[PDB]
Design a protein around this ligand. Structure first.
Ligand SMILES: C=C1CC[C@@H](O[C@H]2C[C@@](O)([C@H](C)NC(=O)c3[nH]c(C)c(Cl)c3Cl)[C@H](O)[C@@H](C)O2)[C@@H]2C=C[C@H](C)[C@H](C(=O)C3=C(O)[C@H](C(C)C)N([C@@H]4O[C@@H](C)[C@@H](OC(N)=O)[C@@H](OC(C)=O)[C@H]4OC)C3=O)[C@@H]12
Length: 194
């Protein structure tokens, strides 16, 4: 839990620009995972005001249904229990390494939401609207405490990895939007069929 917070290098490599951009990598790899299972074909990575990150896929939505073994909803589990769903480190490390984190699962024509602070859930999963679409949405502001030196994302850095991933995993459409400045909005959509 706090192991990722105490040993960040031992979990994301660097606590500099490399580690900051790596937070965006672990959340996107989660969407690529869902996409290679044949459920999502669209990923969107937005750099929002005050260097927040918003990752959106058109997947089935992280299961919201209670884990009959932990009692907590499945979405709360992957985001809170370290390394959950594997052995690529986990969306939970991106959680513990963020001062603020939000989750919006679109499933059962409804929006399930929950928010975290340094991994810690601020409240229990609540339903906050109805929806036509299915998928997951993650917003995070990397913790100012851990990422000493830089918290501002390099667009060209994100562009390069997104362009590569789109090409490796063909069929997937990954989009990058820079919204940090309302007056000049940047966008690059990557979709290779071959
Ligand atoms: C916690 C969950 C619920 C969610 C599930 O992942 C989803 C993800 C999925 O929604 C899809 C890829 N996600 C997205 O679309 C997505 N989109 C975005 C923007 C994001 Cl973020 C995501 Cl995600 C996919 O569609 C569905 C089918 O699966 C996870 C996948 C596999 C596991 C079976 C996992 C689970 O039930 C686990 C458990 O019961 C235990 C927990 C309760 C402790 N656990 C373990 O958690 C640790 C101790 C481990 O530790 C490691 N490996 O270091 C093991 O533990 C062990 C003992 O090895 C690991 O395996 C047992 C688990 O991983 C599952």
């Amino acid at each position: 839990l706090e192991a990722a917070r105490k040993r960040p290098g031992m979990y994301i490599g660097s606590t500099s620009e490399r580690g900051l951009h790596h937070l965006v990598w672990e959340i996107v790899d989660n969407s690529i995972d869902e996409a290679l299972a044949g459920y999502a074909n669209q990923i969107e990575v937005v750099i929002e005001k005050d260097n927040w990150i918003k990752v959106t896929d058109n997947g089935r939505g992280i299961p919201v249904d209670i884990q009959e073994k932990m009692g907590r909803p499945a979405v709360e589990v992957i985001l809170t229990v370290l390394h959950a769903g594997g052995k690529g480190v986990g969306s939970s490390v991106v959680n513990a390494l963020s001062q603020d984190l939000e989750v919006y699962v679109h499933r059962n024509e409804t929006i399930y939401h929950q928010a975290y602070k340094k991994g810690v859930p601020q409240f229990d999963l609540k339903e906050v609207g109805t929806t036509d679409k299915t998928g997951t949405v993650i917003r995070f502001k990397a913790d100012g405490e851990i990422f000493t030196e830089t918290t501002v994302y390099n667009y060209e850095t994100l562009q390069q990895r997104i362009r590569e991933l789109a090409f490796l995993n063909k069929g997937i459409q990954i989009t990058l939007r820079d919204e940090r400045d309302e007056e000049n909005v940047r966008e690059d959509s990557y979709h290779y069929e071959g």
